[PDB]
Write a protein that binds this ligand. Sequence first.
Ligand SMILES: CCCCCCCCCCCCCC(=O)OC[C@H](COP(=O)(O)OCC[N+](C)(C)C)OC(=O)CCCCCCCCCCCCC
Ligand SMILES: CCCCCCCCCCCCCC(=O)OC[C@H](COP(=O)(O)OCC[N+](C)(C)C)OC(=O)CCCCCCCCCCCCC
Lengths: 237, 237, 237, 237
Amino acid sequence: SHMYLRITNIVESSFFTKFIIYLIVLNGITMGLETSKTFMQSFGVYTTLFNQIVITIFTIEIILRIYVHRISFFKDPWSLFDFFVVAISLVPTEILRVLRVLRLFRLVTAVPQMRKIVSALISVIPGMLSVIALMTLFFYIFAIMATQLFGERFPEWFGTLGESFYTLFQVMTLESWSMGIVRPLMEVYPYAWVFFIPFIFVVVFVMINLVVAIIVDAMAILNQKEEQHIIDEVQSH
Amino acid sequence: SHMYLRITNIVESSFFTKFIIYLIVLNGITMGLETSKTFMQSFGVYTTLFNQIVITIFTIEIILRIYVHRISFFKDPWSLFDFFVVAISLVPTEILRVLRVLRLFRLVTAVPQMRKIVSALISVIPGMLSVIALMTLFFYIFAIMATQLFGERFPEWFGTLGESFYTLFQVMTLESWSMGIVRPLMEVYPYAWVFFIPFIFVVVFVMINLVVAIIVDAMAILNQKEEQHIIDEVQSH
Amino acid sequence: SHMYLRITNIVESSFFTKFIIYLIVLNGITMGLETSKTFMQSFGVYTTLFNQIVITIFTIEIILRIYVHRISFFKDPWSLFDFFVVAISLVPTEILRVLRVLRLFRLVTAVPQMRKIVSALISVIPGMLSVIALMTLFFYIFAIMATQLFGERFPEWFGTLGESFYTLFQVMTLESWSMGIVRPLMEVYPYAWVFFIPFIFVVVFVMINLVVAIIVDAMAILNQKEEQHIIDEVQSH
Amino acid sequence: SHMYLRITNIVESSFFTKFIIYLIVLNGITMGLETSKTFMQSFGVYTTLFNQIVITIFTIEIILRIYVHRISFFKDPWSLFDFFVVAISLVPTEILRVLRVLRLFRLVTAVPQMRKIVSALISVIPGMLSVIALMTLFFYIFAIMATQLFGERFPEWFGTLGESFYTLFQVMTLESWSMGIVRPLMEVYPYAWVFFIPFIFVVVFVMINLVVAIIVDAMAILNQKEEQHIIDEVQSH
Ligand SMILES: CCCCCCCCCCCCCC(=O)OC[C@H](COP(=O)(O)OCC[N+](C)(C)C)OC(=O)CCCCCCCCCCCCC
Ligand SMILES: CCCCCCCCCCCCCC(=O)OC[C@H](COP(=O)(O)OCC[N+](C)(C)C)OC(=O)CCCCCCCCCCCCC
């Protein structure tokens, strides 16, 4: 309650937060430099210790932040991310070596402007889950159908549920859907177009109508809010 | 009127609807498993009977639902779909074997959240039919023109009205329209671009303007509705 | 003033307009049939005379419509289109043979629902001309630059102002812009990306912002209109 | 203060501005003509002097405009652009020879309608910088990760941070992302899809949600503005 407040003033200080951001930017520059074989041959020794130093400092920081925030730390998504991103970077030296770079997203955690962007962007998602679920069910059914219609003759694209899922996603982005998949398919299965065209219609119609519904429903609420404000004034005056 | 109500309380019960959804999810898992040759070699016998069982249960369910809803059953699109999807799965064991998977969309029929999504999405369509008709006429005219401009020299892409329709749809999605179709066409017909560019302009302009019109007209009605509410208050107070 | 009204009641009659639409649909079916070599071998004789008949009837119709509408006929875009589309089909039997199919768009001229769609869609265009002009100037400048940067070494894609225009349009649709054009270009000109990336940014930013501006400005006017209505009520009550 | 006003009436005159636009259009036509080797063989001599003449006139114009506007000239973006675009064209005769064409954008500087378009389009950008920054950080992190996951085995696409940036941008436009990059990658790295799919989801989700937020926030302000106007009337009457 006394040594506590000492470190709480540190962890909460403007300097503390600025320092950590400084390190994030430095280490971010460093991780781009470590991309050059030339650079690594000359200064790899320096950059590697600086990475260990930065992660040590970040470890101390996370530790301090937990002593200060106590339980609230692990009920906070931004610090949960800081935690797991620094924890990943702690596992001893193979894909984890690459996931270490995710600690640069810490620059989103630390900068309030960036948090508001991400929070704002994330906020459409909860209301989209049922549509996403519906779409995932749609993909699943069509992936099953495509696996068994086309998998024997086109193993790479449809031989497996996973592969059909992948290909169906490719068709959704419209990437080479016709020259690359459906025309080749139609040389064996001339009615393949009866499968993929409707698939393309549904998947594109749903995406567009999802955007239309977000905008139009947003404004419906905007209208409800100003309607109450105007009516209250009328009711009051 | 008495044995009727006995089964009506069953068919209307929370348990009845939950049970059927349970089966849909189980059978949905099962149909993904039947995709693995390995899995089928080991447990194909089990999964096949479970499919026959599920379809038997679904047959009993449809039958019960018709006795309970009487005529209203066949005037209801969700149960019409349940009907035809279960009926398909009833035809004896080849493409129908694959259409059996459509009974997984029954998970949309049974889950009210999913119905509202689909109903919502479908509701733009009635007001789009005339535009869709106009676009289909557009495709038809340009498919006729392309068949006779390019079909002799490019049979695969334009030799037939059907093939030209297909290719025109591909050009609409912009998939390989230039490297894959129009540049090859222009090596024989250097003015082919005078055909496909304007085609691309119209088809893209119409899609975008359709989205713009749905959003803007939706808000026009939103504005009309709150205008009347505010004015009525003014008129009343 | 007397024989005039006789034909005016004809030309204005519900039957007259329905008959012509009937012919348009029939001849539209016919023009799709004439696409099949098989069909032409058997019934080409019949279809060809029916085409001459239909065009004769359409010629009489246009003539009647001009006597009835007088000058107003040539000040009306829908009848101007009917005129030129029937006139094209009148030139004696080579690309004009294919333009004959454009008389099927007459089904848009004759059906009021279709006219409203087309009128509605066309109505955004006048306010877009300056943006279109700006974009065309943009294409022109970049086509000049690309012709002289890349035309010697890549004649097919940039050897000519016209070809560079074509390729630039292809890059705008994002069709094979990188694997098909810019990566090949970068093997000779490693900074080609400094040309096409910014080009892609501008062209995509302008299209999106054009859509955003149409929607948002539409609603600005919608808001101005209901604001005046509400305020007038407040002012009146 | 006296010879000053003499040239100020010139530089501000309707004729002065029209003359310069005339030259811009002429020189714009000329620069398209200089694209034809045939044309240059015959009239290249003429066009080259006309280019030197035009640039001399533009130099005099810029000089006059600076004497008239004094400091205000270099605090004005449109004239700053005129300045640098004419200055580029002044460097003696290699890429600068091509940048000379940028003086045609002077037609945007000189035509007020075009300025309003460009100003309008630019006005969304300041509020987008933080999102753009967030997206650039996103690209940077994923470019680092992709360089080290895939660069050794796929040097052309990922061997270098710059190349990975380029490829990631290509994946964002969805151009050949699967047939051209990720399927080839997956033949060596079967989990490459775990990298690029989520990358595609984020990058597409962010773009769409950025458009949704611009439209919806624009209308929020539109609603706030008319709400105050209506309420003030209610408050006043
Ligand atoms: C509720 C959402 C539903 C969405 C609708 C999507 C479902 C439609 C999928 C049907 C498309 C079939 C595409 C296709 O080509 O499948 C492959 C089969 C293979 O037989 P086939 O092509 O005749 O030749 C085999 C060649 N061989 C001997 C060398 C192997 O080819 C055929 O069997 C061709 C048979 C024509 C199928 C026509 C189906 C019309 C629509 C069916 C669904 C309507 C009820 C919803
Ligand atoms: C107002 C809107 C303006 C929009 C900006 C668009 C204008 C930028 C275009 C510059 C991009 C240049 C792309 C390019 O690779 O051009 C080709 C030249 C060719 O020389 P190079 O690539 O060095 O090698 C030639 C190879 N050889 C000997 C076998 C022929 O390659 C080079 O010369 C490379 C030189 C680097 C150019 C860097 C330009 C930075 C931006 C310049 C414009 C800024 C002022 C607006």
